[PDB]
Amino acid sequence: NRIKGIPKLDDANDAGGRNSTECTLILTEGDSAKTLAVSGLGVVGRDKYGVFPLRGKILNVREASHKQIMENAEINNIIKIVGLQYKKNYEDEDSLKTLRYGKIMIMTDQDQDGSHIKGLLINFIHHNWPSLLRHRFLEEFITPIVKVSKNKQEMAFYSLPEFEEWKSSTPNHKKWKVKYYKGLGTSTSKEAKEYFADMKRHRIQFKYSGPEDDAAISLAFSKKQIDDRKEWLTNFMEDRRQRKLLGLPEDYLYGQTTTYLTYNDFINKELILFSNSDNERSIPSMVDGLKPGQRKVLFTCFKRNDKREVKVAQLAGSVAEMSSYHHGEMSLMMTIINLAQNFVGSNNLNLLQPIGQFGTRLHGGKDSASPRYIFTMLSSLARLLFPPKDDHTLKFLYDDNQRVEPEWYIPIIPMVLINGAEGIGTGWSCKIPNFDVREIVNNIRRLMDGEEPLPMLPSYKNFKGTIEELAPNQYVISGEVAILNSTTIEISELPVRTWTQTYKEQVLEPMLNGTEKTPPLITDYREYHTDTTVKFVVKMTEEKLAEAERVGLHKVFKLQTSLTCNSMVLFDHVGCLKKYDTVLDILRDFFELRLKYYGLRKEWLLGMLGAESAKLNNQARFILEKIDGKIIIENKPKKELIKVLIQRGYDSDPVKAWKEAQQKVSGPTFNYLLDMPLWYLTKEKKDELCRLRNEKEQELDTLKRKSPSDLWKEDLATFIEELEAVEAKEKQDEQVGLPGKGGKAKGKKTQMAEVLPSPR
Template identity: 35%
Template sequence: MSSKSLITRSSLPKTLTKTNPMDVDNDPPNHSTHTPPISDQKVAVKSKVGKLDFEDANFADSPRSDECTLILSQGGYATHFARSVLSTLGNDKYAVFPLNGKLLTVRGAGPKRLLNNATIKQIIKILGLQPGKHYQDVKELRYGHLMFMVTQGHDGSHIIGLLINFLYHHFPSLLKVNKFMQMFITPLVKAVHKKTNAVLSFYTLSKYDKWRLGNKATDYRILFHVGSDIVAFPEESKYLFADFDQHIKDLYLFDFVDDRAVNCAFGMNIYARNFFFGRRPQFSAYVFDHSPYDHDEGSLVSTIIGMAQNYVGSNNINLLQPIGLPIGVFGTRRRGGKDHVAEGSNLSTQLSPITRYLFHKADERIFKYMRDDGQSIELAWFIPIIPMVLVNGFKGSGTECSSFIPKYNPRDIIANLIRLLEGRKVLPMDPWYKGFNGKIKKKTSNEFTTEGLIEKGKNGSTITVTELPVGMWTKKFNELLNAASRCGDIEAYKNYTDYYNPDKVHFEITMANQQKKSAKQEEWFLNKFKLKTTLSTFDMYLLDEDGLLRKYTTPEEILVEFFRIRLVFYEKRRTALLRKLKIASGLLKNKVDFIGKVRKGEIPLFPLTGKDDWCAELKTKGIQSLPSINGEATEEKEPGTGYDYLGDIPSGWFKDEKFKELEQESKEKIKEYEEQYEELSISTHVSLWLSELTTLDLQLDKEGYTVKINSEDVDSEIAEEAPKMKARAKRPAARPQGANKKSRARCSKKLQVYDNQLPAFYNFGPRQQNVD
């Protein structure tokens, strides 16, 4: 009996379509995008599949076709296993179709392009699908079941996502047919007991991690399987065949959540985190070799390029920058970055100077590293000190769901975070695009209009365009003018001149008749020449900290959500740093003490009678074990391992001259550790964040960013606060009077009360779990 997964229509927004990472671009959303139906295309149906490289099931296209299953396999091992199914279960009811070609992202693809895709075309023909038909059952199909047999993980989920998106968009009724869509699942991890050979199977890494933390994993031999590569072992194939039906999962709509949906805190998808994890010249080759990237290098290159772009309308803050390459090599506003000339072989990039102000290295020790095939890979989360999804924005589309978040001024974001840290209410933020000189006007509570800039000549016959609206690229505007000039679509328009510049806009348009200089005439010109675009905040979908898709109504709501998450991680970082300083100081102190006592002959350098006796002697002589240095109540789990740190002492340290030098250096270093520990222990997570925000704000000020919160009262308030912010940045974190346990407890209690009051400030209502 197979398991079931019932997905309702209200949960469909959780599915964001797999696309090229750089298809999630920076343009305003176009809600008019619609893929034409394919019902007017000629497709051979309900007939033998002819010359396809495919072996049909014997019962296909017969009165018993509803009993047949078409297995779509992806990956070498999956295809091998699928063919093994035929050899064992027979080919009367089963057929295998390997997905060797490139699948198409069907949304936005026209009928001609869709049916030119060989893989899609073959699937339609094999199943006997009739475009435009509403299916209530599978009686008219050549196969009654469609089974996905792919490698588990991101790559396999990608393939399933594309296939289901195709079915949902062109044959949605099929997704409601009972038991039509199925998936064959195999264990990701198997644990085999070293003595009893008992086997434990884990179908998700989360369950494996939970088991590993609560059990003696060292007693087991761990086998990681990339999806169906489990069939490389004959005994495993027998196990799967013996219980074949138990590994089939029925899918009614879709329980696939796209891992490329943008995370609220980082503002980047999982593949961008791959790239951020590696830092080298020839970046794409390095990431390809050092990260578990499952797709082609072209997608990887385009993502790197997107992270390094800095033309108007791209990134407000580019996290990467080129090394020794001219400006514009990663694209310009001429064609919205599509005019880049960078290739994988010459992608010499590095972190931008501002990036380390946003992502502190000290945070890396508190985040969880992801695992792939049992190996530690990139961090699951990178949490910057400000929400980058608001800084650089986001655009993506999927089945019944689109997400668009405009870009906002990082200094506005910093000002609001400081207000939250000081217990004040956030102020409304308007969209802001670095380098954009046009106007952004609020139209409604959820819509903004961006306008280009025009200047009228003295005689009224020449109009100079010096700025284009957000999302209108220079080349696109040029083509629009050229088309209008040929067709005479715009009255009073004669010709134009484009003074080309990669990053600046300069068009001179000649009008046939002199135009009166009036506000009404300017409005006419902006509308006629498409010098207006709209930014909307209606569709701001993001994954929250629990990995659930959530709709946010305002950028301030996203900011408060980020604030709650980030504040917790600052306390985690503070605790981790305190522990690190304590251990570093204790290890150095005990190493020097050990060397001194060995030199005096009080302690043998190596165990002479036994390790246990030697460890006991070290303890009586005042040398601490590692658990003791850590302040742990219990000793080490395996006797003697607590002193393993003494084994990495270089032999040269025992010499007279080196030891004297070591004693002096260790005193200075231990004093430095203790001072840092004392300073950090009397600080709070609030003071740490406040200090780093102030430093980042000053750095942005040096780079020319200005505060743009749209209120005169706010501007004057920030102007008053600026000297205080600069003063805070120049001095260390403030030490409370009588810094002791009581004062820290009072401070913690005050923050706890403040945190509890936080929702009352904004009245966002109950947390939304499912998006309709």
């Protein structure tokens, strides 16, 4: 009785023989954990140790079809390794002895990712074998997350709140050399030996008491308890907000040694952190509409200038190095590719430039090449969207004592209304279609005036399809068809979410031949597709055309598309989630949040210009004094020079003062009055400085004269000019994409008016 199916399994010495109850099956996530286990178990033993590497997410068997259960080979092989039988109750001790193993130990990192794997495993086990949750069948192995060392003294920490309490309870901080442990590649064999030297500290079992815990086990895995999970997340968010406001430290686990672990606290304390993290990283906020990955990428791009092009794979490492990215490399490259996509039906305004094959509009749009095959370059719109002067507005986080990206940004327009926010998280989701960019400026101007803004319509770049709204939060999108002759027909325009391969396989194949129930509808079809436009030389029987007209062209060819927008939940500026009703309310909230910052920017600009103004004034006064002549330069000591500078009414460095009043808002400094070359002593330099000192005075007087209003329009004027330039470049690209072919012929076309089923 031995396993020979997969070679990756570490067959134990007693796996299949005597002492089946003492056989231990270890599940290791990822693949580096397998190497760590092979390197570490060489000292402890090999008899009661069978290691199996894990791939990743586990298929949820609680809600799946019978065909779906037999799909993943690995899940099926788990039974072959263990020996489970669905139609047999494992209640008697002999039934437990029958199994090839007696205990299952799973090990994960201190991150929240392992919580999902543990929950999926508990679901897979309890869904068919609840009675096995009381016979010491499951246990857990843990790892450290951070270690401090000073003078050969090490301390173990397994929780971030534990580390925070250690910092709050110990004096002389920044003395213990700190070392983070984000992944498995950091640990070595010498550390694994110490890890396996103490089993009572890491090898911790579980405990089950009362059926009520099973309800919690079902809480995160029931499709009928969505509102219950919503209330659960709401209670947790309220508790966290109250604790942060009161400043009381939260609770954590693994403070001292533990033998068992209750399921109720296990669900209420560990998996909830993964749920909160997934929700924070999945859906963007309403202020800037940017996800944390896009935020890190854009911040790293802002860090440099990037005048020339740059590789994607090379940029991903630079982003991960400074943004503290700890989610592999594939996800970041995928996010960069999604930011790079700008074809029709995907986005309306990108932050990069299309260089290479970023996926066409024919086959899924995901047929792009390797990130190193393709190149990229920053766009010119980002400079106007995020002005650099806004760097002094938001407060950055402090991780690793490093200046990192902020929590959000302040754009000139809501990005959710221009690129769409499609986020799927726990408790809620977000799906907002695109709109027109030209109407946004008119709406903002009308709102600045104080009039009721007109209702908007979902628009797309390079899309001539009309959209009519019958019921609120519901939209119908149809394409355009051209009838050249009573026999020939051509589809002019396709609606959103229409891929060439999918539409072909789902429409042309059933219509071409006679299916099991439908006669062959079409007689001929051709696909002269260009890079962006489509062509359909399709022939049809004239008699069948009348029936198609009576039924409906959009109905027969399936050109109609219905969408509903109800999940208007976004992260507020504070951090809460509120289900919204209309777009205009979101625009008004953004307008108020933006109005709050005109005074802040004005206060930051006011006085800052005055600082350099006074500095130049003092420099000019020093030059005039030198022209008159009182300060002897004949090897005078610096002490007398500083004394004269103080006695003659010369202030210190204003830039130093503004820098000092930034963290929380010897003696005098006069380096700037002595770091000036002799070129200042020339006539031309003095003449140009005499007006350079007034060039700043003009702007200072204008700022003292101008109001906080009338600035948004002046800022938008340059943006509209740049947008017209970008549209001219797009028209030039269309001229480049012009082969020299003839224009589309005019033909009869109609749009069907679907009866309103009064849905919702």
